[PDB]
Amino acid sequence: MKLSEVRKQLEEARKLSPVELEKLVREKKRELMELRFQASIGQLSQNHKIRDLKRQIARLLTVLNEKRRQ
RNA sequence: AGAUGGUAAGGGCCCACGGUGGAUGCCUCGGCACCCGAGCCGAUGAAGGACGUGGCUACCUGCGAUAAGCCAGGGGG
Ligand SMILES: [Mg+2]
Ligand SMILES: [Mg+2]
Ligand SMILES: [Mg+2]
Ligand SMILES: [Mg+2]
Ligand SMILES: [Mg+2]
Ligand SMILES: [Mg+2]
Ligand SMILES: [Mg+2]
Ligand SMILES: [Mg+2]
Ligand SMILES: [Mg+2]
Ligand SMILES: [Mg+2]
Ligand SMILES: [Mg+2]
Ligand SMILES: [Mg+2]
């Protein structure tokens, strides 16, 4: 995923409430599973999308953790 | 009547060239000694591990279900 898009994901991410974050993760986590399935049947040529989503879920959770910790 | 050479089944010594084998010289990502710097870690769960972790991954390295990585500051180009 693009550098600029990362920064953009973070800005909008840091504006969410934990619940919105929790909900957002669950969907991107669901999208990861959808990706894995098509990856299974050789129907995902844009395979970089898998690594990409994994780190989004990472970046979200990191921020979810940010929200809670002080 | 007498006498003396060509035979090499195979073998021996020398010479040429190969095979095998990995000495020798050169080489060094490693080691060895001395000197200096530096010296604790852990229930806020250590040292050391197990099992996992990649779109395709046997192993090593890294990492821990956020899993060859996540956030921020500094360095760099
Ligand atoms: Mg990043
Ligand atoms: Mg004769
Ligand atoms: Mg002969
Ligand atoms: Mg013969
Ligand atoms: Mg002889
Ligand atoms: Mg020879
Ligand atoms: Mg020499
Ligand atoms: Mg000393
Ligand atoms: Mg020490
Ligand atoms: Mg350990
Ligand atoms: Mg688990
Ligand atoms: Mg920087």
Question: Can you describe what's shown?
Answer:
Keywords: Ribonucleoprotein, Ribosomal protein. This is Large ribosomal subunit protein uL29. The protein is mostly helical. It has helices at 3-13, 18-40, 48-68. The radius of gyration is 13 Å and the shape is elongated. The chain binds one RNA strand of 77 nucleotides through residues 10, 25, 35-36, 39, 42, 44-51, 54-55, 57-63, 65-66.
Topology:
Elements: H1 3-13, H2 18-40, H3 48-68
The structure holds magnesium ion (MG) (12 copies).
It binds one RNA strand of 77 nucleotides through residues 10, 25, 35-36, 39, 42, 44-51, 54-55, 57-63, 65-66.
What structural class do you assign from the helix and strand content? mainly alpha
> What is the overall shape?
elongated
Task: Identify the bound ligands.
Answer: magnesium ion
Measure the end-to-end span: 30 Å
How many helical elements?
Answer: 3
**For the report, how would you describe the main beta sheet?**
none
Strand content: under 5%
Q: Order of SSEs, N→C? A: HHH
Gyration radius, rounded: 13 Å
Query: What's the oligomerization state?
Result: part of a larger assembly
Strand tally, please?
Answer: 0
Helix coverage percent = over 70%
